[PDB]
Design a protein around this ligand. Sequence first.
Ligand SMILES: *C(=O)[C@@H](NC(=O)/C(=N\OC(C)(C)C(=O)O)c1csc(N)n1)[C@H](C)NS(=O)(=O)O
Ligand SMILES: *C(=O)[C@@H](NC(=O)/C(=N\OC(C)(C)C(=O)O)c1csc(N)n1)[C@H](C)NS(=O)(=O)O
Lengths: 595, 598
Amino acid sequence: KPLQVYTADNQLIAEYGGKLSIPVEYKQIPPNFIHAFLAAEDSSFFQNLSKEDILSLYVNKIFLGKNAYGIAAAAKIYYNKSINELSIAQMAMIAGLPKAPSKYNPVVNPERALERRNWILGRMLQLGYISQAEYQKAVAEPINLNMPNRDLNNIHPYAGEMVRSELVKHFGEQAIDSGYKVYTTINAKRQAIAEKAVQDGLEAYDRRHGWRGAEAHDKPLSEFRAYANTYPAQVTKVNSSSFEALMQDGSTVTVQWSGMSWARPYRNANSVGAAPSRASQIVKVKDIVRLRPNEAKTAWSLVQVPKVQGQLIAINPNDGSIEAIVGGYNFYQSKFNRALQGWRQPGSTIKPFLYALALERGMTPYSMVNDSPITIGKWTPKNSDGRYLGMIPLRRALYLSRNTVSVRLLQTVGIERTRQLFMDFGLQEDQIPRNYTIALGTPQVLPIQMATGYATFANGGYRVQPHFIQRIEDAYGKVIYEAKPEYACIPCINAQYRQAQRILKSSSAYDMANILRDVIEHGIGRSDLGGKTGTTNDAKDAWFAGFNGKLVTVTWVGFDQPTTLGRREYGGIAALPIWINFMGQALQGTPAAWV
Amino acid sequence: KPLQVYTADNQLIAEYGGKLSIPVEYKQIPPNFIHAFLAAEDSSFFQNLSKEDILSLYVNKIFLGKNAYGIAAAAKIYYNKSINELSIAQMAMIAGLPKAPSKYNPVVNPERALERRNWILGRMLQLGYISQAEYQKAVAEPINLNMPNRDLNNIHPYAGEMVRSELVKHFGEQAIDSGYKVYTTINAKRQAIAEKAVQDGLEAYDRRHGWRGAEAHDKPLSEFRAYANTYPAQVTKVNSSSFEALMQDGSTVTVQWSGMSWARPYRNANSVGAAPSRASQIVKVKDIVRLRPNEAKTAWSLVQVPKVQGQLIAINPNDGSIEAIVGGYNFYQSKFNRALQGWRQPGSTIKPFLYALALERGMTPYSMVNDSPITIGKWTPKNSDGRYLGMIPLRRALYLSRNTVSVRLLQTVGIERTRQLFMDFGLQEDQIPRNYTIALGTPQVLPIQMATGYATFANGGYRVQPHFIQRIEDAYGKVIYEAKPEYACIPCIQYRQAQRILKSSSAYDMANILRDVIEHGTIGRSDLGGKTGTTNDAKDAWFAGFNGKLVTVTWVGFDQPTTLGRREYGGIAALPIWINFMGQALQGTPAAWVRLEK
Ligand SMILES: *C(=O)[C@@H](NC(=O)/C(=N\OC(C)(C)C(=O)O)c1csc(N)n1)[C@H](C)NS(=O)(=O)O
Ligand SMILES: *C(=O)[C@@H](NC(=O)/C(=N\OC(C)(C)C(=O)O)c1csc(N)n1)[C@H](C)NS(=O)(=O)O
């Protein structure tokens, strides 16, 4: 009974196997397997009937490491075999594990394991259980691990892993052994859209930054893996306008000029070389490249896995339901989920929060704010363009992200009142400094926390908690957990007990939502959308946080090791296209839904 | 449901607790405990109130290290507390364990444990779960582990551990979690006798070789343990005829001259110094000594834990039932079991086996054998006393353990026939050389193997297998295992008949040679036979003996082979232990001898 993961549309997306026990009838056990146990220790005081008799009481229970309880579970976990498919050497390997299933474990100590195994094999021979022929064959046999994957997550990988890693982080490995059916809030259609939007958007950034050369040269093709619809290939012949490449299935393909002409060489983030004029400028024979076929598989193109990373998080602003989550370019690259674990600075993307606090004090979007030079101790917060617009409306100050106005508003609204608000918005106390730079978007945040914050605007001023579990059923069919979330608007559900806490005045949240809608309509065929771009120092991060009354989406683009994305790569350039693509498709065929 | 260890007499002597889970109703959990779990991680995506509802599904299952499954089992294992007796700091400590019950465990990483705990306490404060008063109190609170012992083995330690260690060696730690009742072959009365006989015998050897000085000097008293009716004490004041010592309970005691005057100093294995004339010659202030009190209490005496080791193994020669087992001086001094793990040379104790084969070939105890110098290619075996008795009867050659006669009999018998016999009674093929020195007792053996050997004489020529399990019951009362041993004599008690490894007449004649050896070369008994043994430079002292109902093998020696002394023999050293045990174990039982079946 594995841990089962479902989307909100009843689709089984992942299965997590825990502690495994496959009981077998004693008479079904190969005699050599019993012999391997009998030879595993020099002396039994319980040729020797008694140990065989007492072995039958433990044979399906013995902890053999790596979640294996009993001989059948070990045969499955280690070799993906039935006990009847095991070789003498593999039987001797398993029989050496009861004593210390870590010291003699073949996964952790392969040397120490073979030492123990060969000793048992030698003893099986001395005891007459095996012939010298069987013995020589078995000692020469390598470890031969064929460990099946028991963590099945090949449909919506980020969504599946979110469940396993969270249960394990909070409740440890026993959470998987439970055999529970976890019904998530994940919308499979929206999840599929998000995965494609992040892939396309990262590839769009990547391509405009240029060809970075083959990922490897003169390395074995078998050491590479396909992912994100990219297939490792080896360059075998280079011509003037085309090249030949060897695939992982042994077939040779040809890439025509049209499939590689895009390859202007990357020089740095703000520079690409001249458009290629010959295939020899792009590839060398023995290069390990990535290719992509078309739908028919009649044509192939030279592609590139982006070095840049990204994420997308989409929540329901009324209850905090996580509808879609993408934590990187592709889950094969690494299990790392940037939506939940990726601490980055939010930049201008934090301003709607602070400005909503100014609106709380009695200001209006039209209220005049002062964009002039300022000082705190010695520090001078300067504007992006080194310009000062003087007295301007609050809404224009926000749209143009004026840093002196922000610092001035922080002084008006007080640091602590803002820190408490950032905390109400979802933000971590420890990650929020007790200084004036917070008005700038200096606190490190998680994209999920930003989504929670933007939901306050979409919902009318309420604090919602992001959640991914709708219900949990036991293996026997009983509902053991039903989500009871805090709702911003209870009448809104029935287009439910817990009412969410109001963290912002209704009028301030509504005003900020409309400023955000005006911002998105001065920088999809929809009129119910609002949003804010963000970019950090030296374009180390590109953000877009936006919403409608039914859905909040936060997109991020950047390198894991903070490096410039490029002079031209503002939040509005790199993150915004991902947001648009997802939102346009996720909201296609839904009526206008404002605050 | 722990693993229960029982004696043949249906008496519980040990309990082994495995994986523990004490389920609790959610409403019975202190709110601060739930708060500690809520504060254990920065973000929950299941404030964060949803984690509370999901926590109820895991609260009795969460693996918290050291066999603890669930909050109540951790409160018990770590603090011997109920969840309602836990402090805020202890609740924060437990709540920090789910993530990594090894990287944050207070038993293994106390530094990492406190780091994680204090962080959780800090977060409980920031979340408003605890006041600053509750917080300052809790951070200042030390680890405060009060771990109850769940491996109860304080009655017959070597017997209890034999069961736990064997199940764990063959079937791993899951063997304990099974909740099975093991009804063993151990006789509690005989086991109690054996423990006392080994202790007394080792102490008798020890005392005559002199005072070796305190076991430690300027070391912490808390690092020592009481065992074998010896209590660690620290010398605090030394006078002319007496000394003051600090006990583990904090009380100061006085040892008078009478309690320490025995302390002639050990000079070497064959020498002791002058009798002490003042307490300063025996003890220094800050010395870690062992003391012993009266039957009630009035005075204390300076005692010494022997450096010498010993063992005793007693089996039933008809089925191989292990009736008594003592693996060393004290299980608390050394967990190691010399009866089952102590590979040593048997010396002259092997001779009855070789001489028995010579009887199979048609020789009689009276047959003349040649005790003269002999050369086996390169090797020249010499006799113990460097004497040669010439033509002597086979039985006298055995009694006086004549090495040249043994080598001559090995040539008559043949190495392989001998090796086959050694293997037949349990000796290990790898431990038996393919040379003439085997006649002298050079193969490395276990005392349990020697007991199995000597049972062939007591039973009339049969191979029995030593065994400690009579039956196993599950927690629900069902018999899941019943011993089906090989019996030497079935009418004597399915049923399994043991294999004959020696001729009835050979076993009978060797038994009577052994009887003569014990009756006329050393209890009010005439049904006993036995053999002494001593190895080169008295590195080992043995006594293997029996009656028709019981075989006992005793051994004395140092773990790192060193001489016992010139005088220290068979002897002398291992024989008094055997006598003491046998005399008492057989007290009130009729005469029991072997049976001839030509
Ligand atoms: C908003 O994201 C805003 N960015 C900034 O205030 C920050 N850097 O801006 C400069 C121009 C210095 C840059 O080098 O990009 C900033 C805030 S916190 C941090 N680490 N950097 C931009 C200007 N507004 S947007 O509308 O262009 O996104
Ligand atoms: C038998 O145990 C017999 N001992 C010997 O043959 C051995 N050593 O004897 C000497 C005298 C050297 C000794 O110091 O004890 C011997 C056998 S195997 C080995 N490594 N050494 C003794 C003397 N006879 S008994 O009657 O005491 O058993």
